[PDB]
């Protein structure tokens, strides 16, 4: 049966699709030989503007014209023609060969030079970078931003909940008290980490000839340094310059790179097991519409997608640096996938998004939770104990805690205390609620 | 940009998509929505079937008939249409007992009990079913086949190298000799041993409820078996019973059946290694001086084969767990379970292509057997064992030391207290006479 | 800085090492060697026990004593002798090789015979043998007598809770009510499962020699079968055979043995979370209430993840050796109990975080009591088994509820008088479904 | 049964163990307990250096003399009567009070502000920075000494070889020659590449006590700030400050740590198989041709997976924590030296297995001498430089059974139309001069 939204066996193509849409002008096979045509344009041009080469003769303002406009104008076409070509190369980087090949077929200039397209070039020289353009495209253009957006959603939802109470659960209960804008700051917080990190990352690319040591490119032409060729060349494309490698890109980068956005992956998770958690208390409730509880799934499908994600990350991460000798193609259709946990990390990115957008907080539902546990309040009575020399202050606690603890109690064990009646009158200025030491500014810090 | 297989996010729909074909009628949303309507259908016959419930009457040949027609028949354009009436639903599930509302109410005796279908059903009971039915369908249809297939070339090349002496290596270093066809032979016993494991594997399902309680079926009909229906209705599809869940079925059995999975992709992937090894050595030549083969279907297996157990491993471990009665995690997941199948699916297809290229060098592995003579070290110490003489490898520590030839090997033999017999023995052995039982043993799979 | 729990960088020798003590025995070197002079004297016995063999007659009972005895009394002295006697002869198999030898001199019969240990084999064939012994004896004497005592609890936690009503959640969110003993008797039945199918799970072993082809028993000894004695051997340790290998043993049934561990584990991390959800909720409680704290499940928790963590990596890693092998293998099968041990930690934890629990039954009620929502689910059915029109609108609509709501509504409605009775009947509390009897049926 | 390295269950406290003795000051209970020490000694010592608490006023260096001396000498026995009063108290992190605050009972000055030991902090504070610590020391004196061992190693490997000739493999089979050098340049490159970032990892702590806000801190001295308290106290430590916070620091940073060392680790498995690989091929022999075994390399690639999967799985659970903490993380912690245990013992066992390298130089260049065809490339490139038509299919009419020798290659050329300069320039050359620009490369690697 034909290929369709229906028909895909994978999500990512399948019924969430059409989130993905951004990342078929990428890690497709048609991001695949696009990228492949301009490398290879790119090449022949750089040959063309070396002055050691008389074979290819320096282009006039036209004929780059029509180079650098088959590389802006490449289409879903192009790549059909090129598919087309592959059935008689069988080697799907000739087959581009062969394309850029009848493409210039009619402009004497570029034909005439035309059997310098793909010039001493191995097959990987083209495909590392076609990849390296890739991951990069994909890094500014689409992930960076996404990441931005959660961040940005989380900063909001942390400083519309920054005042806002909420009684602090730890192994599952709980505890001292804390406000929403903190607990989302520090999500915030951790993401911007990894977006920064991320942002850091290197991304390289070599064109190093058949095993990397230049050898044809010398046998042919002696006259050139292919060093500073490649250096230039790699550089040209906004990529970074990795001059020791094999056939191919030892991959390590990619490992980084997916090795960061895992992490942030991770964070989300979090993120999202801690919102499905809040919503299972009724912290949170649905925001009204013009178009009640939240159903939590948008954060559940994110989660589940975003493992998903992670588990491909991760494989790719731990395969592809690891390639026999000198090399191995096991990595080539590995290559392929580039995309797909990159993919589900999106999906899970719009989730979380839509998620956030349905949340509003349930202010007298937490205010009322404090105010029925005040035993969060026998800890700072122990510490202004534990400074004025009152002696075994856990001791003498437990003459409280064990039961009713209401406000009344708590002001009468604090008057029954020795203590400078300051601190008196402080402690006894006290609720769950009011007392979250230094959350607000904290969370004002954040910008 | 449109969808195509061009502009496919991942290799599965992508190029390797051409491949994985059959899947589409399994794992895809098609595949989802045909095993939905199966189950609603299904389930409304038993409705139907029963002399308790009298207000679903049975059904006489016609109104059956179309509802199995309705199953048989189901297409592109119904699943398309389901999806049309999301937009509307927005529930994914409910879409479906619109189809069927809507689809049955041409028939007047399906249309009077039209408000039966999904009767006291929750989303996930019929949802399980169709993962189940995805599942067994998928094993069935594809995964078994493919599996014997491979078995099968693994076979036919034991079959064919049973008799052709082999250099061993350990440690990537020169052993005791062997046959190609016996090497072959091993990975064909570990696989179908995978095979009788997968073939033996339990797909369960259940519905009980939207708790697993039957708590709205005993609502209604209380004087009704639900947990005797329960049994029944998902034995009747080929599935078997799980009696005791929550909301969801645990999904233990999906981790099991991709464990298999993932343990016959991994011998497989020891395989792939393995004759990529061979190849490297000059072992395996061009099928028509002799012409190098190129081990891409092997790579282009082994890289794909793990990237299948990388998501097989996944909902293994990620979906049984779910928080208490269930949380939606899975729902999502679910809908890969076609991916690491797919994956392994290309990497068979893959390995069948690059066993059909395979060539065997016979006078090179003999080369190589006859320029190590030190193998035949070992069968010298041993009967020198057993007839009593003392520091054999330190006797042997003499004749290794320049390289062995037979000559050499002749000399010792005679320098040695044996039975006379058992020296002109000794002396008819070769690194290629020394197989051990590799053949017999390679004829006794069975 | 000797070795102490206290100087140990894991802490499975270390902090929780005196949980772990029972692996001691097993997946020690201790246990190595054990084991392996086990599978050398059993391997000379079996020598001595073939007619076609005369170069080493028949054990009397005497010898048979004092190799009987050698392998039983097997302690940590004679470990450090081979350990030893490994810094002279540099192969760790030699040494045990050379141990057996040395002992056995005391005995004439048995000294006469010493050059025929180790006869024709290869290290693996005693490596791999050790295995088995090792994974079987953990598997019997230890793992399935814990997870049938984490399921005995989960079992008894259903039993006392069986008729006790809870309010479930789906989604976090309030749904369909339960019983709590069924939730635990839904994990019983899944640990049922997996427990049948560790006892299910083969485990193999070989004597092939060599590279597998019995080279060496064939060349000395023509007459002999050895299939037969490699099928006899192995059976008679109390392995499952396996016929066809390499140098080495696949791996593939530790795989399947670990990959059925992993699964329980991954069954016991679902529970554990979600007690630790129900203690959240203060559905639980101590033994004025009592908050517990469930450490022992989030300390379960983690050392299930590392445990399935260790025996997945040992399972997928394990089966892939080079060609005819390659010994990457020899080291990692030293952490065969590393993660099964992290396991212990937790089976052990759980069952103590288990005993801490006991159920809030006004908490639940009081749940239960506040969510009559529920009961807009069977109502509707019924209305759709009496053919009022568009159920789901109308109580979709219908719905702060109280008692009152419903009977009246229940009230608004045409439907017979009978059903009017079964539904003013139910309380979201008495509403358990089938829920009792599912539990009654377990066992 | 007692424990000694016999008894063990784990081979890095067991048969492995002599080689991680360092992580035994480190990552065990010890270290745990050690630095911990540590930090609530300084935590006293800040407290009482400041003036806004009156309550510790500053002590003389009669005083903070002895508390620096407990810091510093602590020892194995001091632990363990750590572990004692952990016996009574249940709470592992109190007997570090208890056992500081029986210390300090001798000075009346110390003893006196005995009770602001451990003030307003909860223990986390106190075992994460305690965690910081174990990393950034383990970081510092163990694994990055390591890495520059071997990252020497593999150098000394790659500027030794740089001139050998190797006939290269691409899946497996004959490729455009290299050098022994540039191939181990290329790992140490790689290498070197992690290292730089291992050691520009972020180390983090946090101390702003139970859920982070400074509650108890602003409670009993509102006076203060203790943000400007938690950022000086923490990076007075050594390590780097993380002011937003839960209970427990999130473990990221371990996450990428963890990255790191698993990415180095995965380099060196490349290696270690690279190797393993040559060895197989007898292009390395012992040192005084004998033939070496790969056992150190099979030994360290073992060890480097388990590493991998432990460092992996901390890595990405620890990040994990049910809202503001669950203590699943507070057992896992325990573990951090275990991963980096398995990578010691790997990095050592390469070492060793680099050690007994010794390259077989004919081997090579017989090897390379069979290998002609090889030089088809560079002439085919010439060909495509002065026009002449159809090149690569001009040869590949070279398959022919007389293979390839130097007087074929010579002949061809000699065939072709070009200046008799590039003529001479392609018969100059042979398959071991045809190294290209390795040595050089091999050369600026420095």
Redesign the interface.
């Known amino acids: 049966?034909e290929?369709?939204?229906?028909?895909?066996?994978?999500?990512?193509?399948?019924?969430?699709?059409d989130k993905?849409?951004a990342?078929?002008?990428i890690?497709?096979?048609?991001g695949l030989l696009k990228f492949r045509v301009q490398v290879e344009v790119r090449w022949l041009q750089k040959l063309a503007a070396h002055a050691a080469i008389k074979?290819v003769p320096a282009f006039a303002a036209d004929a780059n014209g029509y180079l650098d406009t088959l590389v802006a104008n490449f289409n879903?076409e192009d790549?059909?023609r090129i598919?087309t070509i592959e059935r008689t190369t069988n080697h799907d980087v000739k087959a581009v060969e062969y394309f850029l090949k009848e493409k210039v077929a009619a402009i004497p200039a570029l034909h005439d030079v035309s059997?310098?397209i793909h010039?001493?070039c191995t097959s990987e020289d083209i495909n590392n970078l076609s990849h390296a353009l890739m991951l990069k495209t994909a890094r500014d253009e689409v992930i960076l931003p996404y990441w931005r957006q959660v961040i940005n959603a989380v900063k909001d939802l942390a400083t519309q909940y920054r005042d806002i109470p909420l009684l602090?659960?730890?192994?599952?209960?709980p505890?001292?008290?804390?406000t929403l804008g903190?607990?989302m700051?520090?999500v915030a917080?951790?993401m911007e980490?990894?977006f920064r990190?991320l942002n850091q990352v290197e991304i390289l690319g070599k064109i190093n000839?058949?095993?990397?040591?230049?050898?044809?490119?010398?046998?042919?032409?002696?006259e050139v340094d292919?060093?500073q060729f490649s250096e230039e060349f790699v550089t040209s494309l906004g990529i970074q310059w990795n001059?020791?490698?094999?056939?191919i890109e030892?991959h390590?980068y990619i490992?980084?790179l997916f090795?960061c956005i895992?992490?942030f992956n991770?964070?989300l998770?979090?993120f999202d097991?801690?919102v499905?958690?809040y919503?299972?208390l009724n912290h949170f409730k649905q925001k009204t519409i013009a178009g009640h509880?939240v159903?939590?799934?948008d954060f559940?499908?994110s989660?589940?997608?975003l493992?998903?994600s992670?588990?491909?990350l991760?494989?790719l991460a731990?395969?592809l640096?690891?390639?026999?000798?000198?090399?191995?193609?096991?990595?080539?259709?590995?290559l392929?996938?580039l995309?797909?946990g990159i993919?589900y990390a999106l999906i899970a990115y719009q989730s979380t998004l839509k998620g956030v957008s349905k949340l509003e907080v349930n202010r007298d539902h937490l205010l009322d939770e404090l105010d029925h546990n005040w035993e969060v309040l026998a800890?700072?009575?122990?510490?202004?104990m534990?400074?004025?020399?009152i002696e075994k202050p856990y001791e003498k606690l437990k003459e409280l805690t064990?039961?009713?603890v209401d406000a009344e109690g708590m002001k009468q064990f604090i008057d029954s205390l020795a203590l400078p009646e300051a601190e008196k009158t402080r402690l006894k200025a006290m609720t769950p609620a009011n007392?979250?030491?230094?959350?607000v500014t904290?969370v004002d810090?954040?910008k």
């Open positions: 049966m290929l369709s939204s229906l028909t895909a066996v994978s999500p990512v193509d399948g019924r969430y699709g993905v849409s990342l078929r002008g890690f497709s096979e048609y074979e879903e790549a059909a598919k059997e310098f010039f001493a602090s659960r730890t192994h599952g209960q505890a001292t008290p804390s903190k607990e700051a520090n917080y951790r980490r990894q990190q000839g058949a095993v990397g040591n230049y050898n044809a490119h010398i046998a042919a032409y002696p292919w060093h001059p020791y490698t094999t056939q030892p390590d490992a980084e090795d895992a992490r991770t964070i998770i979090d097991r801690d499905w958690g919503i299972a509880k159903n939590p799934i559940e499908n989660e589940g997608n493992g998903l992670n588990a491909v991760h494989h731990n395969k640096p690891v390639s026999r000798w000198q090399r191995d193609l096991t990595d080539s259709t590995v392929r996938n995309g797909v993919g800890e700072p009575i122990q510490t202004v534990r400074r004025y020399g064990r039961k009713r007392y979250i030491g230094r959350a904290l810090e954040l």
